[PDB]
Amino acid sequence: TPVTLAKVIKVLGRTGSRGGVTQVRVEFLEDTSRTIVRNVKGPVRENDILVLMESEREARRLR
Amino acid sequence: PGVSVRDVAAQDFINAYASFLQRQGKLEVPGYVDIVKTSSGNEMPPQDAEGWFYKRAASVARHIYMRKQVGVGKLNKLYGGAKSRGVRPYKHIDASGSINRKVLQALEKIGIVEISPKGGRRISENGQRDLDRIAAQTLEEDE
Amino acid sequence: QHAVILDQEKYDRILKEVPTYRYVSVSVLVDRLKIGGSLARIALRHLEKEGIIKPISKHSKQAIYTRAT
Amino acid sequence: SLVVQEQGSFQHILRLLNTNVDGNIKIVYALTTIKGVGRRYSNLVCKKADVDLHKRAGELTQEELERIVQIMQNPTHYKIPAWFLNRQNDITDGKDYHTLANNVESKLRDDLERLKKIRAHRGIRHFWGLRVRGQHTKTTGRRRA
Amino acid sequence: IIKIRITLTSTKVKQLENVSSNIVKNAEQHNLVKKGPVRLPTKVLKISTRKTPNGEGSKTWETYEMRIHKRYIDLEAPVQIVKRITQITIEPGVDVEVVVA
Amino acid sequence: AVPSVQTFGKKKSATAVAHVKAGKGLIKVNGSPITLVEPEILRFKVYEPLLLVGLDKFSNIDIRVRVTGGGHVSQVYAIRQAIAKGLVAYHQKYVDEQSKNELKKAFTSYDRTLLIADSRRPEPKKFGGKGARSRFQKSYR
Amino acid sequence: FTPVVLATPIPEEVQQAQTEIKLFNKWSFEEVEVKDASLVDYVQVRQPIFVAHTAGRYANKRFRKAQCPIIERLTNSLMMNGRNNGKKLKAVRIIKHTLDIINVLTDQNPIQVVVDAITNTGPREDTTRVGGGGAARRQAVDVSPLRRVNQAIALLTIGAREAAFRNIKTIAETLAEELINAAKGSSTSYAIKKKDELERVAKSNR
RNA sequence: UAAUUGCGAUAACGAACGAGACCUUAACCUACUAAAUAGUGGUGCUAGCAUUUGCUGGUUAUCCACUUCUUAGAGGGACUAUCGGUUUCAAGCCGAUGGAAGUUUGAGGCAAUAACAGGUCUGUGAUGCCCUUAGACGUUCUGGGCCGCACGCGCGCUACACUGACGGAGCCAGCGAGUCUAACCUUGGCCGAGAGGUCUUGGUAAUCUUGUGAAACUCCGUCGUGCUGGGGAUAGAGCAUUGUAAUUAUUGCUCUUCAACGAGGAAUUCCUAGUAAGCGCAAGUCAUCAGCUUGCGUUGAUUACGUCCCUGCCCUUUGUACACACC
């Protein structure tokens, strides 16, 4: 189980048709430089810690 | 150092006083004790068919002590409950007035309550006595 | 289905199996053994007067018990 | 702390009033399978027959089972009030009868036939298979079967 | 002297408060114990018609309110000054009744 | 002579008036002791103003609380108001203002509305529904 | 602990275990920590509470419900399905029996069991619906730490409710055995099965 | 910005209506005005325990004092106050503290120009035109019908049970209504299983009904996974109340009869905090009937703090062979 932790450093905004998906950029909590942008479902604040199944997708804007 | 019914809990005092009325002997209980549903909104006669009347007498005597005085209509509203009228919604239904009147008449005969001015029944001179006796050893029941 | 009366082959099934249970209740007596529920409430008082189980909570809708030793 | 160790006199499904009475249930609700007595009537007849209510119907041997049934046929001579009776001043005789297991159908059919042959409005509605009391039938009452 | 009571019932507070002030104004210019204005809780009379003639439209409901204000003053006075206090205080919207005993 | 402070506490309809006078330390509610307040699971709610600041503060003050209005849960939240308000008003008036201060700080740091009534009030019902916001079901055809 | 004699009786078992450190009914709020990161400061068991009954306002702000104690959040999800709506007194009694039962099987702190059961039951990858035109495709996305707590309480109470519905065991016993089985990865609980099914659906949809 | 709300830019300037302002209601006041038709404390008389000086009471005004609680007059208080952060440095927005109250403080009332062949001639002694006007389409009286049931639809009530049913015990509100030439709200005593009957009493009402001792709720016990003791449909017999009259059961009570229904397909409604939901109570209609409505209080949540995806709405641009205006 390669569970990778991350923390939201900036909330970009909402995405999806109904606006129930929030797009955030996350800092990787294990190395400084790499930051990936993903999308979440529930309510996120600033500097809250996240859990990723796999940090490979590089999620784009939902339709 | 002097205790009253207000210093002891409601449930254990009523159980102790009904048990005291059990071992005392005379309460001239009516002949319809095991026949009557005790309410027009109830469904079944009381399950403890041997001591429900004595529990009603103990609860009524406690209610008279804490209040100024009560009538049968006040007791009917107090002991009544919601009636399941079937397909129609529930509503509040007063209790049986004959049992409450027979309880009050039984209490007057043994001398715990008396008739009162401006209506209703207040507790008697010995009524504060025997209530505070049963209020007394209920505190020292724990060995 | 569930027994409602003891028959000398369900009395003995209490004494050397309930002291092997860390949690007993009304639902426990009717699950591991096949008893009719009304006896389960009776048996919890039977193992109360003599020391088999001890109470840590008493309530008319839920009775939770543990072993005496 | 109230168990008994009775094993021999316990009985299975048993017959009272030519009706199968369930054995391993409480006696007050065991008698309720007799069509003509209910929960409150069976509670009264158990108290009048000096029957402990906590005992199952697999207990209660023959002789006070006869006491229970003798109470059930004849309630009036055992200080059971007249308003507890099933039929009081019924339709012909003026006496009080509590209809029991097999007579409930007969007394109802006799009642239904009496107001049918009299050609009352209730009998014609009963014969037509419609609702006999004053209830609307425009919407409810479907699937007569 | 005799003990009387002046009770005022009104629908207008402005036409009631200054008259009750005027009733008590003629009451301390010469000295006597007041037992002054005790204001009972106000009574709101509610009528709820729907809105409309015959029931077409959205089911809109109304509420019409009538407000009742009540006060009573318990005074004691000789008989010749009980008379001209309830004749000079005549004013719209308020009724005045005097209890003799 | 007989230093006594009266207070009140409110919860949604209820009003619990508490008299805090100097004495030996009895805390009676409606003539019954504080151990007899029987919704039986909010018993520690009437105990929370008693035991947040220590039981030794009640060693010399007699508190008598009478409740009216509200419900069974609403009355309990009104007693614990009047206990905390009665304690802090007694210490404001009759003993040192330093003593009054940490009582308020102990109640504020565990603010279960011990000192401040919540301003939540029931919204009125409007027509066209069975509640303040809810509406009757419409069928459209 | 120097007990104080007083005109009020206030019996000895009350103040002996609370005046030094204020507890639950009788349970310690110390030494319990969220073992699983990203569920810190969203699972709140810092300040102790005597009972799980607070007339507090948590819906007035967006993230204020995270400051509510999770024991009281479990009781709030217990009073559901219409007939039990607004019956918090029953829900406290349910949770009082439940914490006692949980200690009986597993001899550790029932608060600690509840906390780690919340962490183990939280889904970690959910799937959203992207409409477009026609097939209504599904897209796998992440899940907020707050929603992980929200779905954990929702799944644990629903599985406890469904198991106790047509069953002789009480709701308190089914809630306890659900939290026990969800404390570990036993997969005999409804909440763990639902969380695993949700994650493997999102794994296929990614 | 909730707002054609404002900052501003400007061939516009200066205005008016709508919005906002306003009014009502719910929140805060140990500040005033004082209340035996609201309470509180002491004082007298007196009860029970303890006795040690105490606790719980009663005492229609025994008396004295006060207005915290309750009432209602005049007022005060919030204006996003203070601080921090963002923007063209503005209108504003966000975070924290303080505050009873920081979403326009919550909720209403009121509410533009223009229009609909919307509803109402069955509210009107509002009314035009047509009809009828004595065997009347007037009016009145006797019966019946509006409720009639192979079936289809909409609003609901009760349930499918153990977070429960039943039996005792605790006992907790708010909005209101109530009779002089007429029988209104009814306390209390007695009789009755209950429904109810009888003798009196209080009230034209902060006075009495009434603390409306409501229900869900809470303990203790019975039930034990079984269409069972969930459910009470349908039906039989009897007892009472209102009414000139109860049959086509008015309604209430007692005994018996013990159906479907095991969480409901496609669809579809409502809802963001004291809110949904659960629960009962008063009023309307009333002579009798509430499963309806208007309000009220009790218990009291999950989830959002967004988007235009579905259904619609406002503004701008744009196309048009549409103007009865995409039906």
Side-chain angles (χ1 to χ4, degrees):
Chain A
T1 56
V3 171
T4 58
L5 280 280
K7 55 173 304 305
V8 169
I9 37 154
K10 150 166 312 301
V11 179
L12 295 189
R14 319 298 286 248
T15 173
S17 53
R18 279 95 175 170
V21 183
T22 307
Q23 209 157 232
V24 290
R25 189 198 298 271
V26 298
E27 188 305 332
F28 257 86
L29 200 62
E30 294 110 18
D31 77 35
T32 293
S33 160
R34 312 177 20 61
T35 57
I36 198 164
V37 49
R38 292 177 75 88
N39 36 26
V40 310
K41 195 164 174 66
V44 295
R45 260 198 334 267
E46 200 35 76
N47 59 270
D48 53 339
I49 280 279
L50 256 70
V51 159
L52 310 182
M53 302 324 273
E54 40 94 19
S55 73
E56 308 294 325
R57 269 186 64 187
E58 193 72 88
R60 246 295 177 179
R61 192 193 315 121
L62 295 188
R63 172 97 283 123
Chain B
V3 280
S4 70
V5 60
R6 289 203 198 246
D7 315 304
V8 81
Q11 186 184 312
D12 50 359
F13 179 74
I14 274 149
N15 298 342
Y17 198 43
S19 311
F20 176 73
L21 286 180
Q22 260 312 306
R23 81 201 74 121
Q24 189 299 341
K26 49 109 180 179
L27 222 61
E28 76 315 339
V29 296
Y32 56 85
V33 150
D34 44 22
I35 323 173
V36 175
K37 219 203 301 180
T38 69
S39 164
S40 96
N42 269 345
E43 282 185 24
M44 279 305 335
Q47 278 156 5
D48 39 348
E50 302 47 25
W52 69 268
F53 195 87
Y54 300 62
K55 223 154 152 214
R56 275 288 270 248
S59 164
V60 153
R62 186 181 176 273
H63 214 70
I64 293 169
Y65 199 107
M66 304 257 281
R67 265 135 204 88
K68 252 98 163 179
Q69 76 282 326
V70 289
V72 286
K74 303 288 207 270
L75 293 174
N76 289 348
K77 198 175 173 111
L78 168 84
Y79 289 127
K83 163 159 201 92
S84 172
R85 334 171 277 146
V87 70
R88 302 175 278 155
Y90 295 70
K91 84 190 302 282
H92 170 77
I93 281 296
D94 293 11
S96 158
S98 177
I99 298 185
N100 296 348
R101 210 194 335 123
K102 284 307 181 75
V103 157
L104 286 178
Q105 273 156 2
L107 282 202
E108 281 197 53
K109 173 59 58 55
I110 71 83
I112 185 183
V113 301
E114 297 166 357
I115 202 67
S116 160
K118 85 278 172 193
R121 283 171 177 89
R122 84 214 304 201
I123 220 170
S124 71
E125 274 297 299
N126 320 65
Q128 297 206 266
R129 173 172 297 113
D130 62 348
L131 252 276
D132 285 324
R133 300 332 144 226
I134 306 298
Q137 58 306 105
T138 36
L139 268 206
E140 58 191 4
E141 62 100 25
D142 43 311
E143 285 92 13
Chain C
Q1 269 282 338
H2 285 203
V4 311
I5 168 69
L6 301 168
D7 50 355
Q8 205 30 69
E9 274 313 8
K10 277 289 210 162
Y11 198 136
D12 36 4
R13 290 269 320 273
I14 304 330
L15 292 291
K16 78 280 180 190
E17 297 93 320
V18 177
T20 88
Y21 297 155
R22 55 200 286 103
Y23 174 46
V24 313
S25 88
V26 186
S27 89
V28 186
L29 264 327
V30 309
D31 216 342
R32 333 211 77 260
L33 314 100
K34 316 325 324 303
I35 218 159
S38 167
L39 319 89
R41 275 181 281 110
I42 293 292
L44 288 175
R45 310 199 206 111
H46 254 292
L47 287 41
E48 216 84 352
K49 263 77 170 181
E50 37 280 25
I52 285 97
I53 54 176
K54 40 206 298 303
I56 34 65
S57 97
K58 262 297 191 294
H59 180 48
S60 60
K61 289 307 188 267
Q62 172 68 75
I64 319 168
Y65 295 105
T66 35
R67 55 185 62 264
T69 296
Chain D
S1 199
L2 279 91
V3 296
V4 314
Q5 267 332 123
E6 216 294 283
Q7 87 65 13
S9 87
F10 193 87
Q11 327 153 27
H12 259 319
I13 167 85
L14 80 160
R15 294 187 59 86
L16 274 35
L17 274 305
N18 55 68
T19 326
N20 267 341
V21 154
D22 175 44
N24 37 354
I25 209 187
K26 300 269 272 288
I27 172 68
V28 174
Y29 301 90
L31 298 161
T32 57
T33 186
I34 291 161
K35 267 180 49 70
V37 308
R39 305 175 212 166
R40 257 212 77 192
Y41 196 79
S42 75
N43 190 23
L44 184 72
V45 302
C46 280
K47 291 179 192 158
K48 287 308 199 192
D50 188 22
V51 163
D52 161 355
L53 312 180
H54 200 308
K55 319 190 30 189
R56 234 92 189 174
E59 294 92 295
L60 280 77
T61 164
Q62 260 278 2
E63 76 307 354
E64 77 307 18
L65 266 183
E66 301 283 339
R67 270 219 305 277
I68 282 182
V69 305
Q70 273 155 28
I71 275 301
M72 270 172 148
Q73 330 281 15
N74 303 346
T76 62
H77 334 97
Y78 292 93
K79 55 193 58 54
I80 283 186
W83 43 273
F84 226 132
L85 271 290
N86 202 351
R87 292 177 68 91
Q88 327 154 11
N89 187 18
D90 37 0
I91 210 55
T92 37
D93 208 13
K95 318 170 34 193
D96 278 38
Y97 304 136
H98 188 81
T99 323
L100 280 199
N102 240 36
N103 300 68
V104 154
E105 329 319 348
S106 70
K107 210 68 79 168
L108 170 68
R109 259 203 65 255
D110 158 80
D111 267 309
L112 282 188
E113 175 303 330
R114 187 201 93 259
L115 49 103
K116 265 171 193 89
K117 280 283 134 86
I118 220 162
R119 324 313 308 290
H121 184 241
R122 271 178 56 195
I124 307 170
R125 291 281 290 200
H126 264 296
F127 166 69
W128 280 335
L130 303 172
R131 293 282 152 89
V132 81
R133 296 166 183 184
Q135 49 225 144
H136 300 176
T137 36
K138 177 176 192 186
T139 56
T140 49
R142 284 148 147 82
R143 298 315 107 82
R144 314 257 300 279
Chain E
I1 59 152
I2 198 68
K3 166 71 61 187
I4 46 66
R5 188 182 259 182
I6 297 109
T7 307
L8 300 100
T9 319
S10 170
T11 66
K12 312 143 185 62
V13 198
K14 178 62 60 54
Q15 303 330 66
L16 176 64
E17 280 288 335
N18 93 346
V19 190
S20 61
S21 94
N22 195 14
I23 280 290
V24 306
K25 180 193 312 296
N26 297 314
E28 73 305 16
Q29 93 293 11
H30 68 302
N31 279 1
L32 59 175
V33 46
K34 225 55 62 187
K35 295 277 113 176
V38 189
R39 318 149 206 265
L40 299 191
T42 165
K43 314 220 195 80
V44 180
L45 310 184
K46 290 174 191 171
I47 305 292
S48 62
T49 87
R50 270 249 324 259
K51 195 78 89 77
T52 165
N54 81 306
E56 195 268 345
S58 301
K59 275 91 177 175
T60 46
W61 281 91
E62 245 174 338
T63 304
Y64 288 95
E65 296 173 38
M66 156 156 309
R67 308 218 155 109
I68 303 295
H69 305 266
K70 193 160 166 186
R71 276 136 183 83
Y72 71 97
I73 307 167
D74 173 84
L75 263 189
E76 80 301 316
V79 278
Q80 95 301 14
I81 62 167
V82 181
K83 256 93 77 180
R84 72 304 156 271
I85 192 43
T86 165
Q87 324 304 326
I88 61 176
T89 61
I90 299 300
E91 45 75 1
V94 191
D95 90 358
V96 181
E97 58 279 358
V98 172
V99 186
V100 184
Chain F
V2 54
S4 63
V5 182
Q6 43 201 356
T7 190
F8 78 108
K10 290 190 169 190
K11 174 56 174 149
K12 218 179 146 179
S13 180
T15 322
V17 181
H19 305 326
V20 179
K21 75 151 85 182
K24 333 105 185 192
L26 58 74
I27 316 183
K28 285 201 172 297
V29 174
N30 284 104
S32 68
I34 205 156
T35 71
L36 257 65
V37 178
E38 274 186 353
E40 93 171 68
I41 215 65
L42 311 176
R43 187 86 55 99
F44 288 121
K45 308 315 269 321
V46 85
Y47 284 167
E48 267 138 19
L50 255 65
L51 321 159
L52 212 54
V53 299
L55 210 47
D56 48 13
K57 329 294 290 323
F58 295 91
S59 147
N60 50 32
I61 53 185
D62 301 343
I63 307 200
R64 286 167 170 85
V65 189
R66 302 216 96 94
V67 308
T68 326
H72 285 136
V73 189
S74 159
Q75 274 171 352
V76 159
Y77 281 120
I79 307 151
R80 47 171 310 145
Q81 202 118 333
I83 294 287
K85 286 181 64 150
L87 184 50
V88 77
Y90 188 84
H91 276 228
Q92 188 262 358
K93 175 163 258 202
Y94 289 127
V95 301
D96 192 21
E97 213 264 350
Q98 283 302 137
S99 64
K100 151 204 175 294
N101 282 341
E102 63 309 344
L103 282 160
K104 189 173 178 182
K105 289 141 198 62
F107 292 152
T108 280
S109 46
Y110 189 57
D111 189 21
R112 210 174 242 279
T113 74
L114 289 90
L115 302 179
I116 298 305
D118 48 345
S119 53
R120 292 199 280 177
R121 287 291 157 173
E123 214 181 301
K125 178 206 149 189
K126 298 102 192 174
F127 55 91
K130 278 185 78 73
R133 316 290 191 87
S134 175
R135 306 282 91 194
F136 291 147
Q137 167 172 351
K138 52 198 300 182
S139 57
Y140 280 116
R141 77 155 48 84
Chain G
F1 72 105
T2 73
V4 37
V5 61
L6 183 75
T8 295
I10 184 151
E12 203 269 307
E13 61 101 16
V14 177
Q15 81 270 58
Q16 59 167 352
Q18 69 72 26
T19 324
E20 34 263 46
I21 165 64
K22 55 146 301 191
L23 293 191
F24 180 86
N25 275 302
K26 276 300 137 264
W27 282 126
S28 175
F29 260 88
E30 275 309 307
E31 58 56 27
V32 38
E33 43 90 17
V34 189
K35 284 148 57 209
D36 155 24
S38 70
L39 282 202
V40 210
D41 74 327
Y42 282 110
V43 171
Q44 198 247 45
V45 277
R46 304 304 47 61
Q47 66 311 359
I49 44 163
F50 279 106
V51 279
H53 190 284
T54 306
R57 339 186 214 179
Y58 294 109
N60 268 317
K61 273 216 73 64
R62 191 188 182 210
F63 277 91
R64 211 188 268 165
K65 72 166 88 170
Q67 292 137 32
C68 185
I70 62 153
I71 309 296
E72 200 197 344
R73 279 168 65 83
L74 260 174
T75 61
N76 279 337
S77 291
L78 270 167
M79 42 178 216
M80 281 253 152
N81 269 108
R83 52 169 180 173
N84 306 309
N85 270 337
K87 279 176 183 167
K88 199 163 196 158
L89 292 193
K90 218 178 291 277
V92 171
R93 258 297 168 198
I94 284 157
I95 216 80
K96 184 173 171 296
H97 305 332
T98 307
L99 294 185
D100 290 24
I101 291 159
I102 282 168
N103 185 52
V104 162
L105 304 320
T106 80
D107 314 355
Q108 61 263 24
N109 212 22
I111 306 296
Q112 183 45 71
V113 174
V114 158
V115 161
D116 81 62
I118 290 297
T119 64
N120 267 332
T121 44
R124 302 180 277 123
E125 187 94 15
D126 216 37
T127 317
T128 191
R129 161 204 185 88
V130 172
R137 283 262 63 77
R138 310 283 305 277
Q139 187 69 253
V141 285
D142 311 0
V143 53
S144 170
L146 187 75
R147 197 174 208 277
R148 284 157 64 110
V149 184
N150 292 359
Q151 273 228 9
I153 301 170
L155 278 177
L156 283 162
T157 49
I158 280 168
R161 184 161 322 118
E162 290 209 303
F165 179 52
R166 267 177 273 240
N167 213 324
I168 195 156
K169 36 208 302 160
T170 85
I171 174 66
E173 310 178 13
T174 56
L175 182 55
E177 69 102 351
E178 178 86 5
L179 287 166
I180 287 317
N181 292 318
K184 45 177 184 284
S186 72
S187 83
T188 60
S189 83
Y190 176 79
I192 291 291
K193 283 174 159 82
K194 273 293 172 296
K195 164 217 154 176
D196 281 20
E197 190 57 48
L198 254 63
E199 280 183 10
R200 70 143 311 279
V201 154
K203 178 174 205 75
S204 74
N205 274 293
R206 81 178 48 150

